[PDB]
Structures are given as C-alpha cells and as structure tokens.
Design an enzyme around this catalytic site. Sequence first.
Site, PDB file in Angstrom:
ATOM      1  N   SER A  17       0.819  -1.205   0.000  1.00 32.56           N
ATOM      2  CA  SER A  17       0.000   0.000   0.000  1.00 32.56           C
ATOM      3  C   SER A  17       0.856   1.260   0.000  1.00 32.56           C
ATOM      4  O   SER A  17       0.444   2.286  -0.552  1.00 32.56           O
ATOM      5  CB  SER A  17      -0.960  -0.001   1.191  1.00 32.56           C
ATOM      6  OG  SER A  17      -0.254   0.239   2.394  1.00 32.56           O
ATOM      7  N   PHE A  18       2.050   1.213   0.594  1.00 29.65           N
ATOM      8  CA  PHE A  18       2.920   2.381   0.550  1.00 29.65           C
ATOM      9  C   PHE A  18       4.347   2.041   0.135  1.00 29.65           C
ATOM     10  O   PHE A  18       5.249   2.852   0.361  1.00 29.65           O
ATOM     11  CB  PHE A  18       2.910   3.145   1.874  1.00 29.65           C
ATOM     12  CG  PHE A  18       3.288   2.313   3.068  1.00 29.65           C
ATOM     13  CD1 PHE A  18       4.577   1.803   3.205  1.00 29.65           C
ATOM     14  CD2 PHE A  18       2.359   2.076   4.074  1.00 29.65           C
ATOM     15  CE1 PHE A  18       4.930   1.051   4.315  1.00 29.65           C
ATOM     16  CE2 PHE A  18       2.702   1.327   5.188  1.00 29.65           C
ATOM     17  CZ  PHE A  18       3.997   0.817   5.312  1.00 29.65           C
ATOM     18  N   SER A  19       4.574   0.877  -0.480  1.00 27.17           N
ATOM     19  CA  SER A  19       5.908   0.531  -0.962  1.00 27.17           C
ATOM     20  C   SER A  19       5.800  -0.162  -2.305  1.00 27.17           C
ATOM     21  O   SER A  19       4.778  -0.749  -2.656  1.00 27.17           O
ATOM     22  CB  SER A  19       6.681  -0.360   0.016  1.00 27.17           C
ATOM     23  OG  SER A  19       6.094  -1.636   0.138  1.00 27.17           O
ATOM     24  N   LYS A  36      13.477  -1.329  -2.425  1.00 32.69           N
ATOM     25  CA  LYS A  36      12.170  -1.050  -1.867  1.00 32.69           C
ATOM     26  C   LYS A  36      12.035   0.453  -1.769  1.00 32.69           C
ATOM     27  O   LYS A  36      12.856   1.116  -1.139  1.00 32.69           O
ATOM     28  CB  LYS A  36      12.042  -1.682  -0.483  1.00 32.69           C
ATOM     29  CG  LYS A  36      10.671  -1.548   0.128  1.00 32.69           C
ATOM     30  CD  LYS A  36      10.509  -2.478   1.337  1.00 32.69           C
ATOM     31  CE  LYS A  36       9.145  -2.434   1.927  1.00 32.69           C
ATOM     32  NZ  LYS A  36       8.996  -3.483   3.003  1.00 32.69           N
ATOM     33  N   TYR A  86      18.402  -9.317  -3.763  1.00 37.76           N
ATOM     34  CA  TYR A  86      17.365  -9.803  -4.674  1.00 37.76           C
ATOM     35  C   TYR A  86      17.239 -11.317  -4.542  1.00 37.76           C
ATOM     36  O   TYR A  86      18.217 -12.052  -4.712  1.00 37.76           O
ATOM     37  CB  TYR A  86      17.758  -9.462  -6.102  1.00 37.76           C
ATOM     38  CG  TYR A  86      16.871 -10.006  -7.173  1.00 37.76           C
ATOM     39  CD1 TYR A  86      15.496 -10.003  -7.040  1.00 37.76           C
ATOM     40  CD2 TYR A  86      17.409 -10.497  -8.347  1.00 37.76           C
ATOM     41  CE1 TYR A  86      14.675 -10.445  -8.052  1.00 37.76           C
ATOM     42  CE2 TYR A  86      16.601 -10.943  -9.361  1.00 37.76           C
ATOM     43  CZ  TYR A  86      15.222 -10.936  -9.203  1.00 37.76           C
ATOM     44  OH  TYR A  86      14.377 -11.370 -10.223  1.00 37.76           O
ATOM     45  N   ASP A 130       5.869 -12.552  12.151  1.00 41.35           N
ATOM     46  CA  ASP A 130       5.048 -12.783  10.963  1.00 41.35           C
ATOM     47  C   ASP A 130       5.704 -13.805  10.045  1.00 41.35           C
ATOM     48  O   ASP A 130       5.738 -13.637   8.816  1.00 41.35           O
ATOM     49  CB  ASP A 130       4.733 -11.476  10.235  1.00 41.35           C
ATOM     50  CG  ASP A 130       3.498 -11.575   9.346  1.00 41.35           C
ATOM     51  OD1 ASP A 130       2.761 -12.570   9.434  1.00 41.35           O
ATOM     52  OD2 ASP A 130       3.278 -10.624   8.556  1.00 41.35           O
ATOM     53  N   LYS A 132       6.040 -16.871   7.796  1.00 36.17           N
ATOM     54  CA  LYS A 132       5.103 -17.590   6.945  1.00 36.17           C
ATOM     55  C   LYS A 132       5.758 -17.793   5.581  1.00 36.17           C
ATOM     56  O   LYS A 132       6.705 -17.089   5.235  1.00 36.17           O
ATOM     57  CB  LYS A 132       3.774 -16.819   6.806  1.00 36.17           C
ATOM     58  CG  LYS A 132       3.915 -15.416   6.295  1.00 36.17           C
ATOM     59  CD  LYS A 132       2.559 -14.742   6.199  1.00 36.17           C
ATOM     60  CE  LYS A 132       2.663 -13.306   5.753  1.00 36.17           C
ATOM     61  NZ  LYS A 132       1.326 -12.629   5.668  1.00 36.17           N
ATOM     62  N   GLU A 134       5.044 -16.867   2.612  1.00 36.90           N
ATOM     63  CA  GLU A 134       5.127 -15.668   1.799  1.00 36.90           C
ATOM     64  C   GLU A 134       6.331 -14.822   2.139  1.00 36.90           C
ATOM     65  O   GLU A 134       6.787 -14.050   1.290  1.00 36.90           O
ATOM     66  CB  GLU A 134       3.865 -14.824   2.012  1.00 36.90           C
ATOM     67  CG  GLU A 134       2.613 -15.573   1.641  1.00 36.90           C
ATOM     68  CD  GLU A 134       1.864 -16.221   2.823  1.00 36.90           C
ATOM     69  OE1 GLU A 134       2.399 -17.179   3.479  1.00 36.90           O
ATOM     70  OE2 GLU A 134       0.701 -15.751   3.034  1.00 36.90           O
ATOM     71  N   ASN A 135       6.849 -14.953   3.363  1.00 39.23           N
ATOM     72  CA  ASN A 135       7.946 -14.143   3.864  1.00 39.23           C
ATOM     73  C   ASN A 135       9.253 -14.908   3.907  1.00 39.23           C
ATOM     74  O   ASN A 135      10.248 -14.419   4.475  1.00 39.23           O
ATOM     75  CB  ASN A 135       7.640 -13.610   5.270  1.00 39.23           C
ATOM     76  CG  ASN A 135       6.631 -12.484   5.245  1.00 39.23           C
ATOM     77  OD1 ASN A 135       6.420 -11.839   4.199  1.00 39.23           O
ATOM     78  ND2 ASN A 135       6.021 -12.233   6.367  1.00 39.23           N
ATOM     79  N   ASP A 148      10.595  -9.257   5.508  1.00 38.04           N
ATOM     80  CA  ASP A 148       9.427  -8.630   6.136  1.00 38.04           C
ATOM     81  C   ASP A 148       9.654  -8.385   7.626  1.00 38.04           C
ATOM     82  O   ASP A 148       9.054  -9.035   8.481  1.00 38.04           O
ATOM     83  CB  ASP A 148       8.135  -9.431   5.908  1.00 38.04           C
ATOM     84  CG  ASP A 148       6.852  -8.614   6.232  1.00 38.04           C
ATOM     85  OD1 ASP A 148       6.920  -7.361   6.227  1.00 38.04           O
ATOM     86  OD2 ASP A 148       5.776  -9.219   6.517  1.00 38.04           O
ATOM     87  N   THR A 170      -0.203 -12.780  11.108  1.00 38.26           N
ATOM     88  CA  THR A 170      -1.094 -13.301  10.080  1.00 38.26           C
ATOM     89  C   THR A 170      -1.892 -14.433  10.716  1.00 38.26           C
ATOM     90  O   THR A 170      -1.320 -15.314  11.353  1.00 38.26           O
ATOM     91  CB  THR A 170      -0.292 -13.814   8.870  1.00 38.26           C
ATOM     92  OG1 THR A 170       0.407 -12.727   8.264  1.00 38.26           O
ATOM     93  CG2 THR A 170      -1.180 -14.466   7.823  1.00 38.26           C
TER      94      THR A 170
HETATM   95  N1  LIG Z   1      14.236  -8.835  -1.585  1.00 37.00           N
HETATM   96  C1  LIG Z   1      13.419  -9.233  -2.572  1.00 37.00           C
HETATM   97  N2  LIG Z   1      13.741  -9.998  -3.677  1.00 37.00           N
HETATM   98  C2  LIG Z   1      12.735 -10.301  -4.526  1.00 37.00           C
HETATM   99  N3  LIG Z   1      11.433  -9.952  -4.327  1.00 37.00           N
HETATM  100  C3  LIG Z   1      11.019  -9.245  -3.243  1.00 37.00           C
HETATM  101  C4  LIG Z   1      12.035  -8.856  -2.286  1.00 37.00           C
HETATM  102  N4  LIG Z   1      11.447  -8.165  -1.291  1.00 37.00           N
HETATM  103  C5  LIG Z   1      10.133  -8.117  -1.581  1.00 37.00           C
HETATM  104  N5  LIG Z   1       9.872  -8.747  -2.747  1.00 37.00           N
HETATM  105  C6  LIG Z   1       8.504  -8.875  -3.302  1.00 37.00           C
HETATM  106  O1  LIG Z   1       7.789  -7.646  -3.204  1.00 37.00           O
HETATM  107  C7  LIG Z   1       6.474  -7.850  -2.659  1.00 37.00           C
HETATM  108  C8  LIG Z   1       6.169  -6.754  -1.653  1.00 37.00           C
HETATM  109  O2  LIG Z   1       7.117  -6.746  -0.592  1.00 37.00           O
HETATM  110  P1  LIG Z   1       7.191  -5.403   0.297  1.00 37.00           P
HETATM  111  O3  LIG Z   1       8.233  -5.568   1.376  1.00 37.00           O
HETATM  112  O4  LIG Z   1       7.221  -4.224  -0.648  1.00 37.00           O
HETATM  113  O5  LIG Z   1       5.722  -5.314   0.955  1.00 37.00           O
HETATM  114  P2  LIG Z   1       4.971  -6.438   1.836  1.00 37.00           P
HETATM  115  O6  LIG Z   1       5.535  -6.476   3.237  1.00 37.00           O
HETATM  116  O7  LIG Z   1       4.861  -7.714   1.032  1.00 37.00           O
HETATM  117  O8  LIG Z   1       3.514  -5.734   1.859  1.00 37.00           O
HETATM  118  P3  LIG Z   1       2.675  -5.392   3.196  1.00 37.00           P
HETATM  119  O9  LIG Z   1       3.533  -4.401   3.948  1.00 37.00           O
HETATM  120  O10 LIG Z   1       1.396  -4.789   2.658  1.00 37.00           O
HETATM  121  O11 LIG Z   1       2.533  -6.735   3.879  1.00 37.00           O
HETATM  122  C9  LIG Z   1       6.394  -9.267  -2.144  1.00 37.00           C
HETATM  123  O12 LIG Z   1       5.360  -9.896  -2.905  1.00 37.00           O
HETATM  124  C10 LIG Z   1       7.750  -9.887  -2.426  1.00 37.00           C
HETATM  125  O13 LIG Z   1       7.601 -11.177  -3.037  1.00 37.00           O
END
Ligand SMILES: Nc1ncnc2c1ncn2[C@@H]1O[C@H](COP(=O)(O)OP(=O)(O)OP(=O)(O)O)[C@@H](O)[C@H]1O
Length: 284
Positions: A17-19, A36, A86, A130, A132, A134-135, A148, A170
């Site tokens: 939402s903000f990144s 980011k 990355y 958090d 999980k 996804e993280n 995250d 979560t």
């Molecule tokens: N270091 C990275 N390498 C590759 N992809 C990334 C990396 N960091 C984040 N991403 C991708 O960017 C997306 C958003 O991550 P970001 O940290 O911007 O917000 P978020 O924590 O996922 O969102 P929210 O704060 O709403 O939970 C994720 O879906 C993730 O798969």
Amino acid sequence: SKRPEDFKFGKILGEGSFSTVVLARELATSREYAIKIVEKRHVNKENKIPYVQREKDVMSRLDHPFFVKLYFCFQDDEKLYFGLSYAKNGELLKYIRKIGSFDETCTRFYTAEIVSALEYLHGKGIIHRDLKPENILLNEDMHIQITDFGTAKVLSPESKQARANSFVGTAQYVSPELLTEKSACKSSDLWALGCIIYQLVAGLPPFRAGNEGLIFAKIIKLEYDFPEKFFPKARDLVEKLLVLDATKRLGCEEMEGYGPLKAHPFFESVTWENLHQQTPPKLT
Ligand SMILES: Nc1ncnc2c1ncn2[C@@H]1O[C@H](COP(=O)(O)OP(=O)(O)OP(=O)(O)O)[C@@H](O)[C@H]1O
C-alpha cells in the site's frame, strides 16, 4: 550517498500500500539489487512511519545468509529507498502451491534452514512475529532469504525483555499467547514454524478457515488434525512445536534453546554447520 540516478530500474517485483519493490542495476558496479521504495506522502498520510523505521532498524542488525540483507538507504524529496538483496526465485509459498507439498528430504532441508535462521534471529533477541511462506524467499541458489521485518521486534537486552505487546501477524500463523495474553515472545515464532512444517508436508497450514475469527478459535483450542500419511518424525516435531504453553515448545528458552530442537530425530541426517553451502535438493 547513493542517489536514484545511480541505478537503472527494471521490473516491479512487488507492491504494498505504501511501498514498491523494483529490480535495479547499479550503474557504477553492474550489481543487481531489489530496491524497496517508500513514498513519503503515503506513509505520512497513514501514520506508518514506525513500520518503515522498524524494518530499517531490524534489518540493519542482521548479518546472516538466511536473511535478506539491507545494503544501503537513501532518500529524496518524495521517497525513501532501501537497497536489498534480490531473491530471484520468489516466495516459498509459490513452490508449495505448484507442487502441492514437499517430499521428506526437501521438507527436512528447508525446515533446517528456517531453524538455523531462527536460531540466529533469536540469539540476537529479535522476534519475527510474521513468519510464513510468503515471507521466506528463495535466492538464485534456492537457499532461503527471510524478509518482512516491519513487524519484527528487538527485545531490549537492558531489561531482559521477553514479551512484545504489539498486535501483529497473520491469522493462520499467529500464536495462541498473542491471541489470549496479548503479547508474543520468541517462542511465538516456533509456533509459526510448526505451522509451516505442517504446511510443507500436508499442503495447507493446520488452522484454516474462510474467516479469521474461526481460525483464532481453533488455534486457542489446538483444534487441528494430521492427514493419514504424514512423515512420522515430522509429525512428532510438529506436535512438539504446536503446544499451547509457549514455555514448552521445542527450541524455546525454557526448554533450553536450539540444541534440543536441532537434536530432534527428524533432523538426524542434517549437517547444521554448512547448510548455506550445501546444494539444496530439487523440488518436485
Ligand atoms: N528482496 C526481494 N527480492 C525479490 N522480491 C522481493 C524482495 N522483497 C520483496 N519482494 C517482493 O515484493 C512484494 C512486496 O514486498 P514489500 O516488502 O514491498 O511489501 P509487503 O511487506 O509484502 O507488503 P505489506 O507491507 O502490505 O505486507 C512481495 O510480494 C515480495 O515477493
């Protein structure tokens, strides 16, 4: 010190939402970073500055192969920029969905990497809160990169702090103590670990429903079941992590820490010392 013009931006890797996370190449070195980018106006207009500050402070403390690295930070009038490692292969969750579940060797390998990561994080007095799939990202070499940290907590060593009071997480992975006692502890991440191991083997996390309140009710009652075929030593490990009393989870400080967890029979064949230099087993 670095500036936006120092990079060429490519594809968007993710959005919040903000990144926004963009793949970038640094012109002076040809190195690849995930940058980011946080729009100041939105984080201000939503009072989320603390989340951004938390992610920066926590990531700046981490120096371990199983965690996303923060290499640099800079800003301009509109934006904050964070140069991150990355993780080319994306989220662990994508692989659970695609293949349905992991075999025993892959479950063991990735569980061991997560345990190794948590050992390091908890040794620094930090709770993730958090954790999980996804993280848990995957680098080009298919090793984990946990991310995250905006909802992570640095426990104060000066007060020997053990409990953290913010309500974050979560629903599928949130610990019973956070729901009932309104605080989390390092062992809250071991509860999440148990949920993740279960998910790797069974294909779904153990507490699941279409509404969060229903999930909470099952968590606090320890209402879950194992499918008939589930690797038996992995089931035993899950049963030693999904324990309502946070002082009785294998790996927690009251149970004498990571030694007994790494000694669990499910990990008998693991060589813990050089996990990050081992070739991960292929996922199929
Ligand atoms: N270091 C990275 N390498 C590759 N992809 C990334 C990396 N960091 C984040 N991403 C991708 O960017 C997306 C958003 O991550 P970001 O940290 O911007 O917000 P978020 O924590 O996922 O969102 P929210 O704060 O709403 O939970 C994720 O879906 C993730 O798969």
